[PDB]
Write a protein that binds this ligand. Structure first.
Ligand code: HEC
Ligand code: HEC
Ligand code: HEC
Ligand SMILES: [Cu+2]
Ligand SMILES: [Cu+2]
Ligand SMILES: [Cu+2]
Ligand SMILES: [Cu+2]
Ligand SMILES: [Cu+2]
Ligand SMILES: [Cu+2]
Lengths: 454, 454, 454
């Protein structure tokens, strides 16, 4: 058999697991060991997007689940616990395990119970693990996946940083960015029609103030999973290249590629060398996932510009949209205040400010000035002030034809923005009305609901 | 040109073709030959799932079609016959053929006719063949695909077993597991929204008593096709690894991977070494295909356990669901009896027993005992007996909130199971009512139809 | 850094860009240069299919955009202009650029404006470029993508021909082949449900009289892009093999494969050696794209047959359908005449002739003779003449059961053809009625609309 390094030696090792996007330290060991892994399933509500809650089923309290790191040749004694608060039974299938179900039939664990099984890690590589409890797709869709690294005996080459990034497709009853506690939607799941496609379990999980970091000159290794359940990632780094891409424990290593296909249930190790500063975007380049469903993550590089290599600027909201900013916490706060019945004008303003970035600013500018004769102003806009209901219709349904704004004719096309939810339209317009010497007041979600229905 | 081994020598060889999942013997030949291939198209109803018929269009009476095995450098005289019973014309495009359409324009064959053409096999590799008759997608969707192996001159390395597995996506007017003769659905096909995703033309074609077999220590080569028409397979082996994966006749060979992407119309040769006993599941790891649409196949390994490698158990219905059992023939029988107007209580009981496995047993247990205070019992259930109509609503629409069953409170969540068809709900509940000291009687498909409509 | 060939030398070079499917000449240079690239965005209506207009957003007036060819180590001074007629702002992200957004944040260009930025081409390879302006998916869906080649310092090996082919998925409000100016459909785009899947921006862009050409014995290199936005191509050549496939600037080169997966946003260089004459079809082998949505392109090889390699015939309409013929200009003309209110019987006849090929001829024959007792005749058909409205119903809804046509019984199945648009049914039936001694007259689109509604 592969991994024939003899019986376990030394002392038993209690594995230290990490939460995304961090990775345990290299094992730094020259002998096979008995490694005890303890992982606890927790079912819990978390925010999948601002003001959007979802009941996740997790390994270790996170999506993806805790990262496990062992050495090829190790004997792993795997303990799965199911927290007493759980409603469902759970189990585990670790890719890389040699044995039926990857552990599944010996890890069935009812709420409040524990199971264990032992396996030898014969297979070096990066591997997905996931729940294997019928209906398996529901469990995976609810977040039950993570990565296990089985190191080669000599260890991986040293790098400056190691990170943990895992894609998933998610299925809510409601549409993208519809607020509230969103149930799992089996119909969308069977159809492979996700409402969100995310890295690390949430919109913005790895953007803004949650970005990954490194410095010019440093090397970064990313362990990249695709939990699925259903999608295949056209995994890509914007503005950079991967030095190496290696799938699972494969012998083949691809070098110097920017775009690489990760199967559902697959995993890869990628390596990046930081060359010039700025934000490097990890995406699924099936582009509507990246830019319409949440599938964007950032590696932000600090250091000196090199004008011989790249003369240009850091990213902003034209490309990154509303994820250029550190966070969109104002949206969470406004949503909470709506639930509580305490939504103020300022709550709406600050939420709308966050959402305006990209969504409106690309054309109207971050200061609402537009560009005279090309994009009309929202700042001190006579046309806006004249008819706030018309403005709700414009956002929902677009606008074309000749108009006059602040004394100048425009004859262009504003696309419809019907995918915005009622609260989003309301908040954005309340922001605009309360900025730039506009007349104030507010637009409510109910106001927008009525226009959308007419 | 490649394959430049000179003119055909020896005697003409009449190729012996095999039906899935078997493969012809290695050619075991050191000279190029003239090989005569005879393949007959047959249109016929077969069961795509238990009690679900479909009009397949086949090469050689099977889906996938008969396997063809030749040597690089051979001259192949290909004869296509179209059975007199056919309604459609058919033809063939063999990947690996050097010439327009892979043979298509010289193989147009009306019902009751024969065509022939000759090609040299310049290209070693495993290759899909398929029908090439407008509308091509309809013909492929109806089952018209198979594999041709063109061996390298020296032959492939010897292995203990060779098998033939081919994925396809299928488009029925009815939903998954809706009984009856199901028409092809062009709308679903254009949308790439299959109702079934299968290996070898049927649910359960390679599970249970139809599993592939080998023994601990043996090597298994699988010729894996993806007929499509539309899907790309995240092809994966649960609980094992592929020693090698080689696509078509490519020079590159990947080694030691578990998950590998097979294009629509693609084919690969994979190699597996049996290490420990049990069931190894071939899936499309776009998971709802594998676990909700039929895309699972089994390689069952017999031999001694090795507790140093894997301490755990063989798979059961928690992972494999209703495909853990040898077969689900009771469902076929009950469906037939419904058609005939002779459906008995026992017919329903036995069908429901088959369907209960996984679908209900994961939580309620195979003996209906549940787990006290966590999953309520179906065995001798006062709550079930009290209101059989309520039980139909529970299966369709789920249940949550505090309930009392057999003297104990439960406060959990049973997900809706609305994807079950009326007959399935009826049969499952009739099974439950006639087991475990429950009160007997029956639930009909019409009963369930009425609840579903209310 | 890679590409460390020193400062730019010689004279600044103004890059000569080419329109698809042509490629600039090899750079044929041994020193790094400063290369000035000028690319202008143009928004314009073009025909996506005959009689189907679409507002494309283009780099250089074409879909895909102009091809850019530079050498690894070059300093590229990139100038993006946005034509004054544009309504939207645009920018660019070039894969292969080392820097945030691949250029995006330094190329924001309002209508009537110009931007520039400079980058060093560190990375050899073939790379997609595309617009990076929110909503990015809308911009890409409207055609804003192309290829840039960064040659290795020594140049690529010489070949006889180089071509430029780029796949895209498109989202119209109307169905496939519905005539008129078709808006972009955001809902279909988010759902990844394209109405068209095309090479080079239009149905038939690379078929018939627009095919790519080479001769027996010649080598052809194709730079193959996948602009997406969303689909992954099962990219395949019918009746041939790729000598080599190399993705982006990857070190790995696959040899001797026929089917290869191109990620959304990916690109590859493929090499083909012409062996025998005829038409070789480039497809996305997710087959309904190729045969139902437009994803077919042709490389036509001229030269001597070699019966030792392939005895058979060139492709015709059985496989290629209505794209076997040089063009379908009659459809464009009939559509225009409908708009103008001048549609004649002959306009309809000639359009219907074009559409009949494949769609009807596969069974009824190009001369309408059918095959006695198997496919009934359309030529001098008593059954057709007897009831033209019945014939509209047959096309839309199919026909089965015993019928008598010209004295002979048929008992077969004609599938429904409901995906045909009203004008298409009308034109096809008007063609049939005005051919083969049929009674003449005409069927209108309004006639068909009424039957479809009943
Ligand atoms: C560029 C693609 C745009 C984006 C994104 C948004 N708007 Fe827009 N808007 C745009 C144009 C070209 C026009 C004029 C259309 C015409 O017929 O010529 C408009 C117009 C408006 C208006 C009315 C005029 C005014 O007061 O300036 C409003 C109120 C407006 N737009 C609001 C708005 C908001 C809130 C947006 C984000 C949700 C938004 N626009 C996006 C172009 C573009
Ligand atoms: C775990 C995910 C479950 C599966 C799968 C099925 N059932 Fe279930 N069921 C489950 C729970 C947690 C509960 C109680 C819900 C609550 O409010 O606390 C139930 C309840 C029932 C009942 C009613 C109570 C009883 O008689 O025990 C019935 C009749 C029932 N379940 C039937 C049933 C059948 C037939 C299933 C397969 C089709 C099935 N259940 C699946 C949990 C789970
Ligand atoms: C093979 C798959 C077919 C294609 C493609 C088309 N038709 Fe057809 N057609 C076919 C059959 C087998 C039959 C007879 C059905 C039966 O019940 O036995 C028919 C019949 C017709 C008819 C009526 C009979 C006649 O006049 O010959 C018409 C008018 C007809 N078909 C027209 C038609 C046209 C216009 C098509 C392209 C749009 C077309 N058919 C395609 C088989 C097939
Ligand atoms: Cu689980
Ligand atoms: Cu798995
Ligand atoms: Cu056929
Ligand atoms: Cu094919
Ligand atoms: Cu643009
Ligand atoms: Cu890109």
């Amino acid at each position: 058999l592969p991994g024939d390094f003899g019986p376990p030696r030394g002392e038993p090792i209690h594995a230290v697991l990490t939460s995304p996007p961090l990775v345990p330290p290299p094992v730094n060991r020259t002998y096979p060991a008995k490694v005890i892994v303890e992982l606890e399933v927790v079912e819990k509500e978390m925010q999948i997007s601002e003001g959007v809650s979802y009941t996740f089923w997790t390994f270790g309290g996170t999506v993806p689940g805790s990262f496990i790191r062992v050495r090829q040749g190790d004997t792993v004694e795997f303990h799965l616990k199911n927290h007493p608060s759980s409603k469902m039974p759970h189990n585990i299938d670790l890719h890389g395990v040699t044995g039926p179900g990857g552990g599944a039939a010996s890890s069935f664990t009812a709420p409040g119970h524990e199971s264990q099984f032992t396996f030898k890690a014969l297979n070096e590589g990066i591997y997905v693990y996931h729940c294997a409890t019928a209906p398996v797709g529901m469990h995976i869709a609810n977040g039950m996946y993570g990565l296990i690294l089985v190191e080669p005996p000599e260890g991986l080459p040293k790098v400056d940083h190691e990170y943990y990034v895992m894609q998933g497709d998610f299925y809510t009853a409601g549409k993208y960015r519809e607020k509230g506690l969103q149930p799992f939607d089996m119909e969308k799941a069977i159809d492979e029609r996700p409402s969100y496609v995310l890295f690390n379990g949430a919109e913005g999980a790895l953007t803004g103030d949650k970005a990954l970091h490194a410095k010019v000159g440093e090397t970064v290794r990313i362990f990249v999973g695709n939990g699925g359940p259903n999608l295949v990632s056209s995994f890509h780094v914007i503005g950079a290249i991967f030095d190496q891409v290696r799938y699972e424990g494969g012998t083949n290593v691809q070098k110097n590629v920017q775009t690489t296909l990760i199967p559902a249930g697959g995993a890869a190790v990628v390596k990046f060398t930081a060359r010039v500063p700025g934000s490097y975007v990890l995406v699924d380049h099936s582009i509507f996932r990246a830019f319409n469903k949440g599938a964007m993550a950032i590696l932000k590089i600090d250091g000196a510009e090199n004008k011989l290599v790249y003369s240009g600027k850091e990213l902003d909201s034209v490309y990154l949209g509303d994820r250029a900013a550190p966070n969109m916490s104002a949206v969470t706060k406004a949503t909470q205040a709506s639930v509580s019945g305490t939504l103020t004008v300022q709550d709406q303003v600050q939420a709308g400010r966050a959402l305006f970035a990209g969504t409106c600013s690309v054309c109207h500018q971050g200061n609402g000035a537009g560009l005279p004769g090309v994009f009309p102003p929202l700042a001190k806009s006579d046309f806006l002030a004249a008819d706030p209901k018309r403005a709700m219709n414009i956002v929902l349904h677009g606008l074309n034809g000749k108009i006059k704004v602040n004394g100048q004719e425009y004859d262009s096309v504003m696309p419809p923005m019907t995918q915005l939810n009622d609260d989003e339209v309301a908040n954005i317009l309340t922001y605009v009305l309360n900025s730039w010497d506009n007349p104030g007041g507010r637009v409510s979600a109910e106001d927008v609901k009525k226009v959308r229905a007419q």
